[PDB]
Design a protein around this ligand. Structure first.
Ligand SMILES: Nc1ncnc2c1ncn2[C@@H]1O[C@H](COP(=O)(O)OP(=O)(O)OP(=O)(O)OP(=O)(O)OP(=O)(O)OC[C@H]2O[C@@H](n3cnc4c(N)ncnc43)[C@H](O)[C@@H]2O)[C@@H](O)[C@H]1O
Ligand SMILES: *CC(=O)NCc1ccc2ccc3cccc4ccc1c2c34
Ligand SMILES: *CC(=O)NCc1ccc2ccc3cccc4ccc1c2c34
Ligand SMILES: [Mg+2]
Length: 214
């Protein structure tokens, strides 16, 4: 299974990926998460991505395209994978076609930018796993601590209210176009396309996916 999660910042993608990953045994490929910890090491394959990411801007296609091609290669991606955050641009999308990588589903996460900003404020994450929470909507059994590792949670540098704004705008301008892209790709039998309401509680959304995935 090869799936694409399309949607804006704070839409639920990270969260929903957990469920899916274990639900279908496919590796969760998250360009943002991967980029977060690539700079968290220094590695140029990262580093010069901290500034762009913190400013709310997008990383170059080349970079994420290369990053994903490598990731997909691994032996745990031979049975499929979950693309969360990629592709985020037509060039990244086309890059996949030239690569001949057909995708089973492209899930559209529908969420009003209005929720976004109230949603990313209370977002506390656990860097390493990608696992994420909300100090109100989806809290961890223990405050400031990861449920699985019990390791302390953090907050993203880029979750700054204003950067969140930029990020959203960036989305609607660069990524949003993929909604139309993959729709066409759908009206051409190159992938099954499906929208989801990301404003339901995590569990409700988790139901919708199950419903759409099996
Ligand atoms: N291909 C590419 N090209 C160029 N640049 C790229 C790139 N890929 C990545 N990047 C760079 O990477 C950087 C990081 O962005 P990135 O991390 O890659 O994606 P994002 O734009 O930041 O979207 P978010 O991670 O903020 O939200 P999410 O939907 O992914 O996860 P979740 O919703 O659970 O987290 C949101 C919050 O919502 C809460 N939540 C989730 N579901 C629900 C629900 N159903 N109800 C209530 N609350 C919920 C959660 O608790 C959580 O706290 C970007 O700046 C970008 O430039
Ligand atoms: C550090 C940084 O983000 N620099 C680029 C930049 C500067 C000012 C802005 C003012 C208003 C904006 C609204 C939407 C997106 C966006 C993206 C980059 C901006 C910027 C933005
Ligand atoms: C919706 C969106 O992302 N808009 C792009 C954008 C808007 C306003 C700006 C104001 C000042 C700026 C200075 C440097 C870079 C930059 C990049 C995108 C901007 C923007 C920018
Ligand atoms: Mg995410």
């Amino acid at each position: 299974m090869r799936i694409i999660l399309l949607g804006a910042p704070g839409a639920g993608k990270g969260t929903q990926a957990q469920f899916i990953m274990e639900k279908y045994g496919i590796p969760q490929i998250s360009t943002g998460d991967m980029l977060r910890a690539a700079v968290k090491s220094g590695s140029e394959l990262g580093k010069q991505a901290k500034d762009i990411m913190d400013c709310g801007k997008l990383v170059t296609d080349e970079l994420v395209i290369a990053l994903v091609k490598e990731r997909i290669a691994q032996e745990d991606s031979r049975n499929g994978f979950l693309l969360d955050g990629f592709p985020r641009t037509i060039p990244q999308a086309d890059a996949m076609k030239e690569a001949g990588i057909n995708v089973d589903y492209v899930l559209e996460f529908d969420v009003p930018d209005e929720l976004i900003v109230d949603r990313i404020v209370g977002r506390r994450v656990h860097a390493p796993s990608g696992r994420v929470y909300h100090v109100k909507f989806n809290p961890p059994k223990v405050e400031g601590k990861d449920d699985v590792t019990g390791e302390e949670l953090t907050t993203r540098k880029d979750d700054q209210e204003e950067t969140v704004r930029k990020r959203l705008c960036e989305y609607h301008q660069m990524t949003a176009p993929l909604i139309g892209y993959y729709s066409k790709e759908a009206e051409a039998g190159n992938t099954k396309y499906a929208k989801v309401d990301g404003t339901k509680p995590v569990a409700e959304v988790r139901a919708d996916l199950e419903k759409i995935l099996g």
